[PDB]
Amino acid sequence: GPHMATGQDRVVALVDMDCFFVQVEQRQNPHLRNKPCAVVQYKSWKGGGIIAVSYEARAFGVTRSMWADDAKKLCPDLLLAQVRESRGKANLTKYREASVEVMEIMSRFAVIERASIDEAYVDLTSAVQERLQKLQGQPISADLLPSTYIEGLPQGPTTVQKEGMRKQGLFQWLDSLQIDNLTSPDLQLTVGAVIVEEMRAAIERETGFQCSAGISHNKVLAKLACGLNKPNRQTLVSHGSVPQLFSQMPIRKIRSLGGKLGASVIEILGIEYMGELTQFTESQLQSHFGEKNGSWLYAMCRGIEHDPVKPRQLPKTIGCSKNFPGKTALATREQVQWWLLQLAQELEERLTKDRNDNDRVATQLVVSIRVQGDKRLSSLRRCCALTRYDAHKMSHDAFTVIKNCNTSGIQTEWSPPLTMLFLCATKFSAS
DNA sequence: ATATGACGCT
DNA sequence: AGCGTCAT
Ligand SMILES: Nc1ncnc2c1ncn2[C@H]1C[C@H](O)[C@@H](COP(=O)(O)NP(=O)(O)OP(=O)(O)O)O1
Ligand SMILES: [Mg+2]
Numbered sequence: 001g002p003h004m005a006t007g008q009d010r011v012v013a014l015v016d017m018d019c020f021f022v023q024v025e026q027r028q029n030p031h032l033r034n035k036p037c038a039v040v041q042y043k044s045w046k047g048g049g050i051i052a053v054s055y056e057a058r059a060f061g062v063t064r065s066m067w068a069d070d071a072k073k074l075c076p077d078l079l080l081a082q083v084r085e086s087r088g089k090a091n092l093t094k095y096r097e098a099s100v101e102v103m104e105i106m107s108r109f110a111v112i113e114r115a116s117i118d119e120a121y122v123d124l125t126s127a128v129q130e131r132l133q134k135l136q137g138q139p140i141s142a143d144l145l146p147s148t149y150i151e152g153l154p155q156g157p158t159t160v161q162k163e164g165m166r167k168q169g170l171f172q173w174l175d176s177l178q179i180d181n182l183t184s185p186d187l188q189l190t191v192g193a194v195i196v197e198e199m200r201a202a203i204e205r206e207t208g209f210q211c212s213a214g215i216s217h218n219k220v221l222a223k224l225a226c227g228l229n230k231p232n233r234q235t236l237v238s239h240g241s242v243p244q245l246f247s248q249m250p251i252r253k254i255r256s257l258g259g260k261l262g263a264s265v266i267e268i269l270g271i272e273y274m275g276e277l278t279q280f281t282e283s284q285l286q287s288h289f290g291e292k293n294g295s296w297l298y299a300m301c302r303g304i305e306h307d308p309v310k311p312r313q314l315p316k317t318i319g320c321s322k323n324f325p326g327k328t329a330l331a332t333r334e335q336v337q338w339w340l341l342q343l344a345q346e347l348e349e350r351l352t353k354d355r356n357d358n359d360r361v362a363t364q365l366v367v368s369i370r371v372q373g374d375k376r377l378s379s380l381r382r383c384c385a386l387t388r389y390d391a392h393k394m395s396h397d398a399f400t401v402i403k404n405c406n407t408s409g410i411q412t413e414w415s416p417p418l419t420m421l422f423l424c425a426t427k428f429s430a431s
Numbered sequence: 432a433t434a435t436g437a438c439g440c441t
Numbered sequence: 442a443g444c445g446t447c448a449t
């Protein structure tokens with residue numbers, strides 16, 4: 001009772017850009033704004049695979065991973081923008097640079113952890129306290145949170161509109177706030193949400209990009225909260241909202257549970273929602289899923305998670321990959337050498353950029369391949385030393401460490417055909 | 432036939 | 442080290 005830890009010791013946020021690749025193209029081309037539009041790679045095969053969808057196009061049913069020709073059937077007025085192609089492969093330089101614009105603005109407010117190209121976690125714990133002493137006891141007006149939803153609110157007896165429902169929840173939340181108390185976790189989330197409103201106001205104002213965000217006590221709840229009110233809104237998930245939120249929250253919606261372990265949690269325990277995990281003791285969950293998973297599950301279903309926000313705005317690896325599906329699979333020794341050079345050339349261009357910008361050198365190269373028929377994403381991984389940022393040496397050394405896999409007695413041929421080539425620069429050191 | 436990045440297990 | 446899982 002008096003000695004229970006509720007996991008209310010941190011204020012963690014997850015900011016995620018709304019249809020990021022689309023917004024990047026819409027800022028560059030005004031004709032694409034406020035219209036159903038999507039981003040595609042490789043216009044040849046069925047018009048190109050869609051990798052980002054605007055919300056105007058999502059209303060028609062256009063989704064990611066869909067072929068552009070199929071998406072034109074659902075949305076005939078759909079506009080398209082192609083990803084730049086360099087050396088025969090997709091080139092995402094325009095979006096990595098747009099990412100750095102946002103990451104540097106978020107870095108001004110608090111420590112962030114780059115989670116993807118369009119999202120980063122934030123640890124607002126140190127920023128919330130210093131803001132609390134600056135507001136010497138004065139309350140928080142709703143004008144400081146013009147786009148914040150309070151998950152679970154409004155409730156009970158006192159509108160039909162979406163935005164009307166938002167403020168009544170914020171009103172109930174603010175009216176019950178304990179500003180008398182600086183050790184109140186619910187007050188810390190509110191100050192954290194005020195800061196995120198300022199961060200997101202700075203992002204849109206200095207880049208033109210809109211984003212959603214989640215504010216809670218850990219990374220998992222923040223990411224879940226971020227998806228509740230997209231687009232362009234932030235959601236506060238408090239500790240008290242967890243039981244009702246998790247009572248019907250599918251297990252797959254929780255981070256790290258959308259894969260196989262989440263499936264076995266559903267099958268073995270025979271449950272549907274995240275809240276049903278509270279019935280089980282920790283030893284039971286440890287016996288079914290291991291000591292790490294059982295401990296993590298037992299605390300997560302109660303809204304408690306301890307994975308810290310690592311101060312890391314830079315990637316740990318720099319890699320280049322390209323798939324060769326179907327009959328396009330590389331089957332000649334000349335093809336494999338040529339594409340390894342194309343990958344190594346772009347890799348050098350990115351590594352030299354990384355060494356001048358970020359003062360570090362990659363020290364080893366990882367070569368990954370997939371053969372025709374193998375189900376796993378990777379079929380084989382071999383590694384060597386990355387001494388020079390030389391595209392011809394890297395591609396040559398990459399070929400040296402994979403030429404054994406060629407089960408073809410012929411010199412000029414390559415069997416089995418290669419489905420994917422992948423070079424990855426890892427193991428950085430200060431330069 | 433939809434290019435990447437972080438991390439755990441052994 | 443090499444493979445597997447999870448994610449955008
Ligand atoms: N499977 C994939 N293939 C290629 N590119 C992808 C991808 N997933 C993401 N991207 C690229 C394209 C995306 O623009 C960006 C982030 O994708 P999200 O954050 O998962 N979803 P979005 O930001 O598009 O909209 P919203 O967050 O409101 O749902 O990374
Ligand atoms: Mg996004």
Ligand SMILES: [Mg+2]
Binds near residue numbers: 116
């Ligand atoms: Mg995202």
